[PDB]
Amino acid sequence: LGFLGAAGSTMGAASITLTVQARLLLSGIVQQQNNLLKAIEAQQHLLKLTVWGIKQLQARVLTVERYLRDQQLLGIWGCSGKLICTTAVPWNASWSNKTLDMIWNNMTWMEWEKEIDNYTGLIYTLIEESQNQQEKNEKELLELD
Amino acid sequence: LGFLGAAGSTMGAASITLTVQARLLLSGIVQQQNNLLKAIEAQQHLLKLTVWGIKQLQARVLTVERYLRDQQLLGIWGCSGKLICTTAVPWNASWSNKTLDMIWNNMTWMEWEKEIDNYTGLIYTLIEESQNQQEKNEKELL
Amino acid sequence: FLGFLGAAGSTMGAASITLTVQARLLLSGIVQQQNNLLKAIEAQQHLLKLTVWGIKQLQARVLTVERYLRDQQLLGIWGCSGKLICTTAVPWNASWSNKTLDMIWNNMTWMEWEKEIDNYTGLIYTLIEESQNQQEKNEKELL
Amino acid sequence: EKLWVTVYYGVPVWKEATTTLFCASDAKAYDTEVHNVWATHACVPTDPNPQEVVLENVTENFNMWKNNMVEQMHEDIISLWDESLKPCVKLTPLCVTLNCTDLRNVTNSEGMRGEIKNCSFNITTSIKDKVKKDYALFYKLDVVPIDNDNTSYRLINCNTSTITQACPKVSFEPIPIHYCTPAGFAILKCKDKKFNGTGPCKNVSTVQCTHGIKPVVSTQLLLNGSLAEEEVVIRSSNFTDNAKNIIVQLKESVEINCTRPNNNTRKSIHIGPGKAFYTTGDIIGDIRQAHCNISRTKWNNTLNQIATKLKEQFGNNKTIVFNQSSGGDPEIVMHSFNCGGEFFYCNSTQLFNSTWNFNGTWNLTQSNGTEGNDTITLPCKIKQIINMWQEVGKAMYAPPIRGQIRCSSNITGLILTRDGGNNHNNDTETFRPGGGDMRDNWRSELYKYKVVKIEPLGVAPTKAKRRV
Amino acid sequence: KLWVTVYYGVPVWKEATTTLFCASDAKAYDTEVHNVWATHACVPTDPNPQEVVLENVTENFNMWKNNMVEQMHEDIISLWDESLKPCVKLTPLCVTLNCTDLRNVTNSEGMRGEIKNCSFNITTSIKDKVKKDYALFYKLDVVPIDNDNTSYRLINCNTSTITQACPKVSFEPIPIHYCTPAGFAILKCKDKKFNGTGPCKNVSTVQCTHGIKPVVSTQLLLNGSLAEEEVVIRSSNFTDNAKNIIVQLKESVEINCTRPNNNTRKSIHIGPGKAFYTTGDIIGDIRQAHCNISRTKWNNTLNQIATKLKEQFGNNKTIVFNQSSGGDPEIVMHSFNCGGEFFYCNSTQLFNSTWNFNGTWNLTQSNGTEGNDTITLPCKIKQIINMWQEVGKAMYAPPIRGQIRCSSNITGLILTRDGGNNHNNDTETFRPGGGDMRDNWRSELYKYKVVKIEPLGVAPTKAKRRV
Amino acid sequence: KLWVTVYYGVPVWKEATTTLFCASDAKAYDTEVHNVWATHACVPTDPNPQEVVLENVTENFNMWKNNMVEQMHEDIISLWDESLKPCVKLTPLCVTLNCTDLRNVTNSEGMRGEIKNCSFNITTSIKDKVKKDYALFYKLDVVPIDNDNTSYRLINCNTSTITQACPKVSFEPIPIHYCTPAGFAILKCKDKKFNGTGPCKNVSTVQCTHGIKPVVSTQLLLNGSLAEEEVVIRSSNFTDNAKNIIVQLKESVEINCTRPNNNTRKSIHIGPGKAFYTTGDIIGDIRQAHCNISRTKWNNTLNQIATKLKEQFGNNKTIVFNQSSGGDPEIVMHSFNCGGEFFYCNSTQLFNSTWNFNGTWNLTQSNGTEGNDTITLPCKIKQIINMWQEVGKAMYAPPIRGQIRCSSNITGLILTRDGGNNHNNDTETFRPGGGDMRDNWRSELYKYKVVKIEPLGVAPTKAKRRV
Ligand SMILES: *[C@@H]1O[C@H](CO)[C@@H](O[C@@H]2O[C@H](CO)[C@@H](O[C@@H]3O[C@H](CO[C@H]4O[C@H](CO[C@H]5O[C@H](CO)[C@@H](O)[C@H](O)[C@@H]5O)[C@@H](O)[C@H](O)[C@@H]4O)[C@@H](O)[C@H](O[C@H]4O[C@H](CO)[C@@H](O)[C@H](O)[C@@H]4O[C@H]4O[C@H](CO)[C@@H](O)[C@H](O)[C@@H]4O)[C@@H]3O)[C@H](O)[C@H]2NC(C)=O)[C@H](O)[C@H]1NC(C)=O
Ligand SMILES: *[C@@H]1O[C@H](CO)[C@@H](O[C@@H]2O[C@H](CO)[C@@H](O[C@@H]3O[C@H](CO)[C@@H](O)[C@H](O)[C@@H]3O)[C@H](O)[C@H]2NC(C)=O)[C@H](O)[C@H]1NC(C)=O
Ligand SMILES: *[C@@H]1O[C@H](CO)[C@@H](O[C@@H]2O[C@H](CO)[C@@H](O[C@@H]3O[C@H](CO)[C@@H](O)[C@H](O)[C@@H]3O)[C@H](O)[C@H]2NC(C)=O)[C@H](O)[C@H]1NC(C)=O
Ligand SMILES: *[C@@H]1O[C@H](CO)[C@@H](O[C@@H]2O[C@H](CO)[C@@H](O)[C@H](O)[C@H]2NC(C)=O)[C@H](O)[C@H]1NC(C)=O
Ligand SMILES: *[C@@H]1O[C@H](CO[C@@H]2O[C@@H](C)[C@@H](O)[C@@H](O)[C@@H]2O)[C@@H](O)[C@H](O)[C@H]1NC(C)=O
């Protein structure tokens, strides 16, 4: 339930309000359903070393891996909070030529990130290192004074 | 170590003492025994088999997700930080119309959950939806 | 700059800047994340059922997950969960290595420094937990 | 005019990805401790309320011919069958010369010519000191003639494989299986009422779990599968290539009443330590050949439909011809499938014997009473031994089911092969029934689905900036 | 006016079932026992066990419905299956046997064929030549076929596969601390007296269970635990007769058991390198295996048990200890494993005591310390152990070279109350029971209940979000 | 006054032992050829490995106590066992064999009786007929029994169980990358010359080992890694004797090896679907397998190794290169696998030099191919190969159709310093060694070591908390 099926809508309207409500719905749901089924089956003890059981165990690992890598990344860039955080990293001129309206009201999320793929590693690295190190230095200076 | 010793005590007795501090130590001890065990066995390599290798592996899994599913809950309502955190959700009198004396100085945590068992899921979902309203207010402030 | 633990030969101050890069690869598991995606086979045929490598790879995954989970749990128990760097109310007892900050941040490397402190590592960690418990009791006194 | 990088979690963004799948069947299947069912033991509970969020303004591309899930679950059910029969008896000692009678007797009208066989022999059990003469019953399909001495015979795949009987208790009724994905992954559903199986799909929704899919395996005729919507739909890798099989999904379910009208007493000979070879004891009453009931008009109407469809695909001014399989392994030559566990090889010659015309295909068939459309009866056989489709090795024996057996499958699909014979200036297109490939029988259920991982991380410029 | 407040780390548990792992302290592993019952997989135990006391707690306990009893049952089944899995199947030795009387008539010799020197023909790795040879078998192992006053086989050969237990693997019991994973806890009922299931007022909690020796024994409990201050009777329904009666003793009764023979351990090469192990011969007199019980001590314990059984079924009823009714050898005769060797001991002497409520009187001891202090249990020996749950999967115990000497501690009983026509008489006829390993484990895990830990909690407080 | 400051992601590592996974190149999967005994399970190699260098670091190494050697040793053993375990057991074939030394006395032929046309009687899948079937074997596979001129069997029957390799699975080794799970790292010594134990001048790290081809070779290291500017000699104790001496070469020596026989593979069917693969016959003339080796190249290589050995055992020394003393063919006669067939080559020619005190230094020159007539290696074939550390579990190598062609590069030598009573002579002798998969692993893993990365860190800082 609450699966983000608003890929067709551009970040112009859905991202501002509709997606965040749906995202909170999905995060709570994909947590409630998965762990509900897990608890029920674990009590039943039907789970075993059987072929299907090793498929379930492999998937249980993948869920954990995906969730943990995501949360790690988020915490490694300070955004341990909610789904929307604003970094102090400027937008490089190398990726541009699109107006705020283009990026938001005209470009769908799937289409937008499909042009940033050549720069995804650079953007993610230059976010985590910049803001996190700078904020650590600031905290240290404030505590010293 | 640091196991639920105050579970026989009432909600308030337990809260003013062990729940705030001993339980924090209990989570640390849970990590300490895991840190020692998961290391020493890693210095064995006779582990990670099937007859007991799968048993311990399944247990380690179950610990992992059983802890994450709670971290996730804390994340969905924003309480990823302090173990004790309040909510903007008003406690509806419909859920147990009893005075705070009967709630804390009387009911113990174990019997408290049984009366609130029907409310549990309802309240947990209400807390996250209230967080969404607060997040929209935060966007307005931004 | 340095791809990985380049600041290993560097002192305390130099290694602080690259901490985020070294902390991203803790659970990144980039080599393991992609399975046989190029050949469009998941986990090389679900680890070929339970082949010798299948077991080895699956076990290596849980260790990356539990090791990071344990580290994050430690961060959580002392409060500074999300924060990579956090101050603590624990005064630094002068007994552990009587050295000036200059010698530490400008001369002593992190790898060489965590051979001295190994003796008192657990002591220090528990001191941090009790200081957080003291902070919680002080908060209860305020309430 | 300053834009800063802002991290957004939970962006509606997915990418092509292949992953592990896990089964989910039914709570009712667990109820009554059926156990024998070889597929529901480790399945998780199906969510009673499915989640089918619809996608709007989306035209996702789909390639069912390049579907991961197909191969994934193909090897899954290939291994799943192997694990089920792995603890069961290996019928290695049975590879012996057999003294086989006429039927059992000449107590004679006579529609049989050897189906009972009454193969007798001398075999050794776990007691490795005494030969133990006895006898069992086998349809000619399982007894290969040897030595041409007259009554010398041996099991069909003794010199090519190892025959393992299924554990008698093991029941072989498929139950709906809902593939579900680990979180962070989703299944995209191509909910268009008409899909070529290739190219972009406009009407599109998604599910965290596939709809119920019985892993029914059948050749030529798809049984108890899925129905097409409003129109019969034909999907091929390359229609103009002859080698490519042709998936034909019917929009109409056709009832096929298959039965084994022989009351059978079942005898369990003990061979080896606690290992027991289950075989037929005898047949009570007359033996009647297994038959299947097919409505003539309903089938001919479906024939008209698929014929018009193949004309539309190729040339609307072509003659269509329907022949039977050229030759090869029995599975492809005749419609074979499991019924209550016993396997029936029905000579579906009559099913594909009608040739239509571009000039023809003008009207449909209307029955004038029950005796008008007297249901066609298909000559069906029983093959107890089945070699794995992929490898002649590890052939599996089917324990005989005691007494009466009767099934009522609904034909939901067809498998066809075009032969590029020299009929250029003839336009006479011949299509022959094809099968022998489990993957083809899964492509006919997985086409609408597609697995994509979800990467809910996203970054975009915003005038907002982190406080210093 | 109040708001719900999320509470993490709340003292709340719930009954649940979960995977549990073994833990042996690796003392056996450092010794180098070559993996006994999979000791190389048990994680080392905590140096100091923790048993936090749960004051003001009345947790209900249900030992009969406990999941641990069945989880352990299946895990122990898997252990015994893994042990025999790589071992040598004995399919070729399912043949006809030419057997002598014992070893010779140059023998007093009360034994009447317990060695039955059997000889036969076999096919070794060289699958072209027979090889006559002789090995020794106790009558329990060999069944005679056709009764032509000769010709023998093996009891389960035709209907069941036998697998010889590997000699390198010892079968000595080792303590096991079934430890629960984090987020789960084991509740420990510390009442001085229990009825199997019921509310418990003295309760504690353990991260791992106490060390447990998974011994499979029938009609007796060996190397087990001791009750507190009083013998305790436990049964799901004492009022019905079909259910077994679990008894736990307050004191231990030493059981000196030994095979007093020097045995040469001949090995026969069968197939490609697979060596079937047997007994060459027995140097010296063939003294029958026997067990030593204190006559006074066993009577005193039997009177304690009788008084407890009287309490259960009224003072009016008198307690009768009759011998096992009949059935499989393990049920009819008490049977265990000694030093990797399985015994079979006649239990008639132990269960031949009738107690009248009028005559109960006191306990009978002896000023004399010499004579009438030893109850010698006539023990026979069986190697081919039939599986307890399934007809197939029978196992073979290789003989242990030399004399095998053991000394256990009788720590309880397994009994069966019958529906006799002596109900009008008012006599409770109690007979030894066995054949179910779950009862053996119920005798240990009764005091434990598995509950998960839910640190999540909600609570109305005057506190409100600091927005 | 200072306060503790918890640091996360700090570059501190501690020597650790952990499980590692294999990551072969994407190209190996692209072939679609069935797994080569250890291949498909592996994850694909990351296009470019990260070899981040650790400047200002002097990390100590211990190649002789590295866990990875043992871990991989066990991995390669288990990988072979899993690959050949589903295949056919050749236990039914342990039968008396009637053999002719040569099918035709075509005199001529170098072989005196290598062909040994052995015809046996085997029960087929049909357990009713004995079918006399002929098959071809080498002397190394058949033991003469009964002292009869034609009575033969197999080397490992009563001794061990033979299992043939599945023909579809090939044997061409492929480069493998050992990668650690995240939070762990591999340190690579960058020192041009390394003793293998002690501090490293330049250190680097890789999350993945360089590609290693797990070739198993004796007295030689084939298709192995090379040294830098100088042949390196490593041994835990050079002053010891039993310690095998590892040598890594700086220059690769090409070795061209081929079995020059066109062979047809008869597939005899034995039992229910189990088909044993043998040799139908040899097409054309029969030529013994050989290997070609440059004279000068080998001599100059021996010159460099002899200099290195005088350096490590006193400047004034005379090193005699001799052959193995005796024992199993594995370590006496150099052996390896060419195209999935085992080759045993008598490398007596390689080490037949007495040497001079000052004869060294003048490197010999190639005055034409007539001068440097390439060294010919008398090679044999042993189809039945035995487990190196296990008496049982022997494996049969199916024959390969056609003529095999191989061209590996010599990259290393294994040596054994004998402690002969010749200290006054100062004639150091170094016999070829081998016989241990670990020795091969140590040669390629010397530069690697695995360390857990602890991101948790402590440090006093003036910074305090916010009350
Ligand atoms: C791999 O490489 C090796 C190395 O090149 C090849 O083998 C080499 O072959 C060389 C000959 O071709 C051989 O050289 C001979 O060495 C003999 C002994 O060497 C020592 O002694 C001499 C002389 O020192 C003496 O005097 C001092 C005091 O001044 C004393 O202290 C000493 O103890 C000695 O008494 C030194 O020069 C060396 O350096 C060593 O210390 C010599 O006897 C020999 O001299 C001549 O006599 C030999 C017969 O006795 C004869 O075989 C040889 O050819 C010499 O013949 C002379 O006369 C003829 C005719 O006039 C003339 O054409 C010659 O040119 C020569 O003048 C040589 O000096 C190397 O010792 C030897 N090295 C090794 C390690 O074996 C090997 O072939 C090659 N393999 C391949 C496959 O390529
Ligand atoms: C893609 O999805 C759209 C929307 O569901 C499909 O269009 C729908 O087509 C059906 C007929 O096939 C229409 O039903 C008709 O509705 C009208 C009134 O709207 C009524 O008068 C008719 O009797 C009939 O019931 C339906 O309205 C129509 N929906 C829309 C929104 O136009 C379309 O067929 C799908 N295409 C594919 C390729 O799947
Ligand atoms: C073990 O012994 C206990 C007693 O120590 C038995 O428990 C008691 O059994 C009775 C009847 O089975 C329970 O019912 C009672 O009935 C009267 C009828 O008026 C009612 O007034 C009581 O208050 C109660 O309902 C009783 O609850 C139960 N427990 C106690 C504490 O008495 C038990 O049956 C024995 N066996 C087992 C397996 O526990
Ligand atoms: C099913 O229909 C689609 C749409 O017409 C076909 O896809 C087109 O293929 C042609 C080439 O034959 C291209 O020129 C078009 O651009 C394609 N359209 C798109 C956007 O998909 C598809 O080939 C048909 N498939 C079958 C099996 O007939
Ligand atoms: C037991 O039953 C008694 C019935 O009368 C008794 O009959 C016999 C057994 C005599 O020996 C004597 O015990 C009695 O006269 C009841 O009187 C008695 O209360 C019942 N219960 C007890 C506590 O014994």
From TrEMBL, chain B:
Residue stretches spanning the membrane? 1-16
What is the disulfide pattern of this chain?
79-85
Region (Immunosuppression) spans which residues? 55-73
- Membrane topology designation: Single-pass type I membrane protein
Q: Where is the Retroviral envelope protein GP41-like domain?
A: 11-142
Q: Where in the cell is it found?
A: Virion membrane; Host cell membrane; Host endosome membrane
> Where in this chain does the entry annotate a coiled-coil region?
114-142
Q: What is this protein called?
A: Transmembrane protein gp41
**Species this chain originates from:** Human immunodeficiency virus type 1 (HIV-1)
